[PDB]
Ligand binder design. Structure first.
Ligand code: OGA
Ligand code: FE2
Ligand code: ZN
Lengths: 347, 17
């Protein structure tokens, strides 16, 4: 333990409340929370200063179109499930909100989150909800320069910069319109990048996270529960179809933490941090991926899915050449055997 | 090869009825 492993030793989800001054520089603040060990949990919450807002009001989006909403059919039992996303016909937020608030797909009543959580894991395979996920677009106003998911200005911009290649949702923003019981399966980001998520408005979004330090253990458990999927694609979790309840993680000794995101709050996932969750009710979130110098090693060692052809793939060549010149030759010759230290920040 | 070294979409699988 060299102060690196001494910071956030429990590797739990930390929450930060930056001042408008600290909040101003995105990349700087990220390096700051990592200095406090936030990356150890694989997920961190950041509450923006109360006087900050990305948009005046959202009373003008009932017209926004959700080109490919999906109905989430889930099959499984005893805390292990597989989610099949069926594409539905395009619809407007108005139509979505209508259904979301209907008593058919409405959020059930409950006292404490614990109860809402139990209801989620108890009925996720019933009454398949609709999720207006992965919608190209932003809700930020052109003038917002602080934490603008549309232009974070991280080194991830080097992909577009160097090749002009655009990867929707990765180096471009996505909007997610959810309803009660809509969920996102266990996964790390594409190329094990970082992700940023802002809940514009609506009901909460709860998250589960596994410390990057224990990610391989989660994979081994997953492989064992879905042997078939594992042999057809080592990185089958990237298909984003696998759901595992916290009781199952608990039963097999896989450390994890949970947190609930409220409207107006940001969530940050770190490289190789597995996460999953579900929406409490009607809500809208925006997110994209971003990179840091620390991500580079992760990107070089990311295990990718090949069984599918349309998966996100990023050439690490431009990053190794620019930030690891002394190792470019070695890496290009597949002799770079660097070992990643998940607790180490970026000295 | 058989695919680009850089590209793709974040939107996961999409099955249709
Ligand atoms: O919004 C969702 O359903 C899933 N979001 C993420 O996985 C993220 O922001 O990193
Ligand atoms: Fe994610
Ligand atoms: Zn695959």
């Amino acid at each position: 333990a060299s102060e690196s492993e001494t910071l956030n030793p429990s590797a739990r989800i930390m929450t930060f409340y930056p001042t408008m001054e600290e909040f101003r520089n995105f990349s700087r603040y990220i390096a700051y929370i990592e200095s406090q060990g936030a990356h150890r949990a694989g997920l961190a919450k950041v509450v923006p200063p109360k006087e900050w807002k990305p948009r005046a009001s959202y009373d003008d989006i009932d017209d926004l179109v959700i080109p490919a909403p999906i109905q989430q059919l889930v099959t499984g039992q005893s805390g292990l499930f597989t989610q099949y996303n069926i594409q539905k016909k395009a619809m407007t937020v108005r139509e979505f909100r209508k259904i979301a608030n209907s008593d058919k797909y409405c959020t059930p009543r409950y006292s404490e989150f614990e109860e809402l959580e139990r209801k989620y894991w108890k009925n996720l395979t019933f009454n398949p909800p609709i999720y207006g996920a992965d919608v190209n677009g932003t809700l930020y106003e052109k003038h917002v320069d602080e934490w603008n998911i549309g232009r974070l200005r991280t080194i991830l911009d080097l992909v577009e910069k160097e090749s002009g290649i655009t990867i929707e949702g990765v180096n471009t923003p996505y909007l997610y319109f959810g309803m009660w019981k809509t969920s996102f399966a266990w996964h790390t980001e594409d190329m094990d990048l970082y992700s940023i998520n802002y809940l514009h408005f609506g009901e909460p979004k709860s998250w589960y996270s596994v410390p990057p330090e224990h990610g391989k253990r989660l994979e081994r458990l997953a492989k064992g529960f879905f042997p078939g999927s594992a042999q057809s694609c080592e990185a089958f979790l990237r298909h984003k179809m696998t759901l595992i309840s916290p009781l199952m993680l608990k039963k097999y000794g896989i450390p994890f933490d949970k947190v609930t995101q409220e409207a107006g709050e940001f969530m940050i996932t770190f490289p190789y941090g597995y996460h999953a969750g579900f929406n409490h009710g009607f809500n809208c979130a925006e997110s994209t991926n971003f990179a840091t110098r620390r991500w580079i090693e992760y990107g070089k060692q990311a295990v990718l899915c090949s069984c599918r052809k349309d998966m996100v793939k990023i050439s690490m060549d431009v990053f190794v050449r620019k930030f690891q010149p002394e190792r470019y030759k070695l890496w290009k010759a597949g002799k770079d055997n660097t070992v990643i230290d998940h607790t180490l920040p970026t000295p | 090869k058989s695919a680009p070294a850089t590209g793709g979409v974040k939107k996961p699988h999409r099955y249709r009825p």
